Design a protein around this motif. Structure first.
Motif, PDB file in Angstrom:
ATOM      1  N   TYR A   1       7.134   3.910   0.276  1.00 54.89           N
ATOM      2  CA  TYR A   1       6.703   3.779   1.662  1.00 54.89           C
ATOM      3  C   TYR A   1       6.184   5.082   2.265  1.00 54.89           C
ATOM      4  CZ  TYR A   1      10.164   0.125   0.602  1.00 54.89           C
ATOM      5  OH  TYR A   1      10.935  -0.842  -0.009  1.00 54.89           O
ATOM      6  N   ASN A   2       5.623   5.958   1.437  1.00 56.03           N
ATOM      7  CA  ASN A   2       5.018   7.190   1.962  1.00 56.03           C
ATOM      8  C   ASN A   2       3.501   7.046   2.082  1.00 56.03           C
ATOM      9  OD1 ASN A   2       4.865   9.825   2.960  1.00 56.03           O
ATOM     10  ND2 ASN A   2       4.595  10.708   0.905  1.00 56.03           N
TER      11      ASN A   2
ATOM     12  N   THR B   1      -0.514  -7.927   6.774  1.00 58.26           N
ATOM     13  CA  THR B   1       0.943  -7.766   6.701  1.00 58.26           C
ATOM     14  C   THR B   1       1.326  -6.307   6.464  1.00 58.26           C
ATOM     15  OG1 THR B   1       1.208  -8.077   4.322  1.00 58.26           O
ATOM     16  CG2 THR B   1       1.066 -10.085   5.709  1.00 58.26           C
ATOM     17  N   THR B   2       2.635  -6.068   6.319  1.00 59.02           N
ATOM     18  CA  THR B   2       3.162  -4.721   6.089  1.00 59.02           C
ATOM     19  C   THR B   2       2.882  -4.265   4.668  1.00 59.02           C
ATOM     20  OG1 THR B   2       5.389  -5.509   5.514  1.00 59.02           O
ATOM     21  CG2 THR B   2       4.979  -4.999   7.836  1.00 59.02           C
ATOM     22  N   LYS B   3       2.468  -5.194   3.816  1.00 59.43           N
ATOM     23  CA  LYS B   3       2.177  -4.843   2.429  1.00 59.43           C
ATOM     24  C   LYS B   3       0.683  -4.560   2.252  1.00 59.43           C
ATOM     25  CE  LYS B   3       4.373  -7.527  -0.501  1.00 59.43           C
ATOM     26  NZ  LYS B   3       4.993  -8.772  -1.044  1.00 59.43           N
ATOM     27  N   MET B   4      -0.019  -4.436   3.373  1.00 59.12           N
ATOM     28  CA  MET B   4      -1.462  -4.158   3.378  1.00 59.12           C
ATOM     29  C   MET B   4      -1.771  -2.949   4.231  1.00 59.12           C
ATOM     30  SD  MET B   4      -2.711  -8.052   4.005  1.00 59.12           S
ATOM     31  CE  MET B   4      -1.935  -9.396   3.009  1.00 59.12           C
ATOM     32  N   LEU B   5      -2.938  -2.369   3.996  1.00 58.31           N
ATOM     33  CA  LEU B   5      -3.441  -1.281   4.829  1.00 58.31           C
ATOM     34  C   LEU B   5      -4.893  -1.573   5.202  1.00 58.31           C
ATOM     35  CD1 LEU B   5      -2.320   1.985   2.926  1.00 58.31           C
ATOM     36  CD2 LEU B   5      -1.338   1.136   5.064  1.00 58.31           C
TER      37      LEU B   5
ATOM     38  N   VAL C   1      -9.502  -4.352   3.894  1.00 53.55           N
ATOM     39  CA  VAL C   1      -8.057  -4.467   3.696  1.00 53.55           C
ATOM     40  C   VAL C   1      -7.679  -4.190   2.237  1.00 53.55           C
ATOM     41  CG1 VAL C   1      -5.963  -5.785   4.256  1.00 53.55           C
ATOM     42  CG2 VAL C   1      -8.075  -6.177   5.557  1.00 53.55           C
ATOM     43  N   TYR C   2      -6.619  -3.409   2.103  1.00 53.02           N
ATOM     44  CA  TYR C   2      -6.173  -2.822   0.842  1.00 53.02           C
ATOM     45  C   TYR C   2      -4.702  -3.162   0.588  1.00 53.02           C
ATOM     46  CZ  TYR C   2     -10.419  -0.225   1.594  1.00 53.02           C
ATOM     47  OH  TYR C   2     -11.744   0.088   1.810  1.00 53.02           O
ATOM     48  N   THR C   3      -4.371  -3.377  -0.676  1.00 52.31           N
ATOM     49  CA  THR C   3      -2.976  -3.493  -1.084  1.00 52.31           C
ATOM     50  C   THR C   3      -2.332  -2.153  -0.837  1.00 52.31           C
ATOM     51  OG1 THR C   3      -3.566  -5.069  -2.771  1.00 52.31           O
ATOM     52  CG2 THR C   3      -1.408  -3.948  -3.012  1.00 52.31           C
ATOM     53  N   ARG C   4      -1.205  -2.167  -0.145  1.00 53.33           N
ATOM     54  CA  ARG C   4      -0.488  -0.942   0.192  1.00 53.33           C
ATOM     55  C   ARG C   4       0.405  -0.525  -0.994  1.00 53.33           C
ATOM     56  NH1 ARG C   4       2.577  -0.606   6.061  1.00 53.33           N
ATOM     57  NH2 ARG C   4       3.010   1.655   6.051  1.00 53.33           N
ATOM     58  N   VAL C   5      -0.106   0.368  -1.844  1.00 51.55           N
ATOM     59  CA  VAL C   5       0.553   0.678  -3.125  1.00 51.55           C
ATOM     60  C   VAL C   5       2.019   1.117  -2.954  1.00 51.55           C
ATOM     61  CG1 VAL C   5       0.535   2.181  -5.238  1.00 51.55           C
ATOM     62  CG2 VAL C   5      -1.611   1.038  -4.445  1.00 51.55           C
ATOM     63  N   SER C   6       2.301   1.865  -1.890  1.00 53.32           N
ATOM     64  CA  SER C   6       3.656   2.402  -1.639  1.00 53.32           C
ATOM     65  C   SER C   6       4.719   1.328  -1.399  1.00 53.32           C
ATOM     66  CB  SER C   6       3.647   3.390  -0.477  1.00 53.32           C
ATOM     67  OG  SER C   6       3.428   2.730   0.754  1.00 53.32           O
ATOM     68  N   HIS C   7       4.280   0.096  -1.167  1.00 56.23           N
ATOM     69  CA  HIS C   7       5.197  -1.026  -1.062  1.00 56.23           C
ATOM     70  C   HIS C   7       5.317  -1.830  -2.332  1.00 56.23           C
ATOM     71  CE1 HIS C   7       5.114   0.152   3.011  1.00 56.23           C
ATOM     72  NE2 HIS C   7       5.604  -0.963   3.524  1.00 56.23           N
ATOM     73  N   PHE C   8       4.751  -1.345  -3.433  1.00 56.59           N
ATOM     74  CA  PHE C   8       4.884  -2.062  -4.694  1.00 56.59           C
ATOM     75  C   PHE C   8       5.498  -1.236  -5.833  1.00 56.59           C
ATOM     76  CE2 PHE C   8       2.934  -6.172  -3.791  1.00 56.59           C
ATOM     77  CZ  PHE C   8       2.243  -5.902  -2.614  1.00 56.59           C
ATOM     78  N   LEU C   9       6.127  -0.104  -5.518  1.00 54.79           N
ATOM     79  CA  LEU C   9       6.599   0.769  -6.600  1.00 54.79           C
ATOM     80  C   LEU C   9       7.617   0.114  -7.543  1.00 54.79           C
ATOM     81  CD1 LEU C   9       6.710   4.214  -4.724  1.00 54.79           C
ATOM     82  CD2 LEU C   9       4.779   3.225  -6.006  1.00 54.79           C
ATOM     83  N   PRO C  10       8.536  -0.714  -7.005  1.00 55.00           N
ATOM     84  CA  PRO C  10       9.475  -1.303  -7.975  1.00 55.00           C
ATOM     85  C   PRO C  10       8.767  -2.260  -8.921  1.00 55.00           C
ATOM     86  CG  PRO C  10      10.482  -1.253  -5.810  1.00 55.00           C
ATOM     87  CD  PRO C  10       9.037  -0.816  -5.621  1.00 55.00           C
ATOM     88  N   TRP C  11       7.814  -3.004  -8.377  1.00 59.20           N
ATOM     89  CA  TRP C  11       7.015  -3.887  -9.204  1.00 59.20           C
ATOM     90  C   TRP C  11       6.273  -3.090 -10.280  1.00 59.20           C
ATOM     91  CZ3 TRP C  11       1.874  -4.672 -10.490  1.00 59.20           C
ATOM     92  CH2 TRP C  11       1.601  -5.871 -11.170  1.00 59.20           C
ATOM     93  N   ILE C  12       5.655  -1.976  -9.888  1.00 58.99           N
ATOM     94  CA  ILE C  12       4.888  -1.175 -10.849  1.00 58.99           C
ATOM     95  C   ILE C  12       5.836  -0.607 -11.900  1.00 58.99           C
ATOM     96  CG2 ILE C  12       3.554   0.981 -11.170  1.00 58.99           C
ATOM     97  CD1 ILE C  12       2.445   0.346  -8.243  1.00 58.99           C
TER      98      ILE C  12
END
Ligand code: VG2
Length: 247
Positions: free
Chosen positions: A126-127, A178-182, A230-241
């Motif tokens: 989330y940074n 959403t919060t998972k987007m930028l 609109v972009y996938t917010r990478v910092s909200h997917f770290l556990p998935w990655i």
């Protein structure tokens, strides 16, 4: 990319060009991606969801041109194509629009870094840069919405991050964002990502480091007023990655 400038792979050495093979032997460009480690390219699920067979895909690194060779470029098969199991699409919005391609040369090797082939760092959890930060996008996407072919030469441009509060106004995208987007856009609405740029990087300088902050995902039209990219917010997917780049 609408607006911006033509660029070369040495300026965006993490950029990955992803293509699909067809019966008959034609290859078409699919989407961009980003090298996040020697063996792994990260992209967008929506690019693959209709043709999820990994054998159909070819990934280039160190490539500046769409349909011709670049000196130093390297070609890869997809050893594993990982789509997000929670991917979905509404009228406009794509959710969990993120994918992983484990790459390997025909000899079984991963990418070897060079001047034209380099990894891009992931953000920390989330940074994200503050809204108003200028970040760059790269891609072989359309230069105009009326175009029916992609440009032959890679492009880049600079857009500014837009707050969730701005982006979620009813006349922007409302709660579709959403919060998972930028969201990111040009203040004058003249430059933007467009069809064909999906999966590619939104790169921002985070604490002195070039960071994969976003992945090109969706939007309404290209460089339209009040309609940001609109972009996938990478910092909200770290556990998935983390989890999918293991076993
Ligand atoms: C990033 C972006 C993507 C697209 C777009 O066409 N996306 C897209 C989504 C999905 Cl699910 C499928 C496709 N493909 C369309 C071509 C045939 C294969 C499928 C394609 C369309 C636009 C306008 C765009 O830019 C928005 C920001 N200006």
């Amino acid at each position: 990319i609408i607006g911006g400038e033509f660029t070369t792979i040495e300026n965006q050495p993490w950029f990955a060009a992803i293509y699909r093979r067809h019966r008959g032997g034609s290859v078409t460009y699919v989407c961009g991606g980003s090298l996040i480690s020697p063996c792994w390219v990260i992209s967008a699920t929506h690019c693959f969801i209709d043709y999820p067979k990994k054998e159909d895909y070819i990934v280039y690194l160190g490539r500046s041109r769409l349909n011709s060779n670049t000196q130093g470029e390297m070609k890869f098969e997809v050893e594993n194509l990982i789509l997000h199991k929670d991917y979905s699409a509404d009228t406009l919005a794509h959710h969990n629009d993120i994918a992983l391609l484990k790459i390997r040369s025909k000899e079984g090797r991963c990418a070897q870094p060079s001047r034209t082939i380099q990894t891009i760092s992931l953000p920390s959890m989330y940074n994200d840069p503050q809204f108003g930060t200028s970040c760059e996008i790269t891609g072989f996407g359309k230069e105009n919405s009326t175009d029916y072919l992609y440009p032959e030469q890679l492009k880049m441009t600079v857009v500014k991050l837009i707050s969730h509060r701005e982006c979620q106004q009813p006349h922007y995208y409302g709660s579709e964002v959403t919060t998972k987007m930028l969201c990111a856009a040009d203040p004058q609405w003249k430059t933007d990502s467009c069809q064909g740029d999906s999966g590619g990087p939104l790169v921002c300088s985070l604490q002195g480091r070039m960071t994969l902050t976003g992945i090109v995902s969706w939007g309404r039209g290209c460089a339209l007023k009040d309609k940001p990219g609109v972009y996938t917010r990478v910092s909200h997917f770290l556990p998935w990655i983390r989890s999918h780049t293991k076993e």
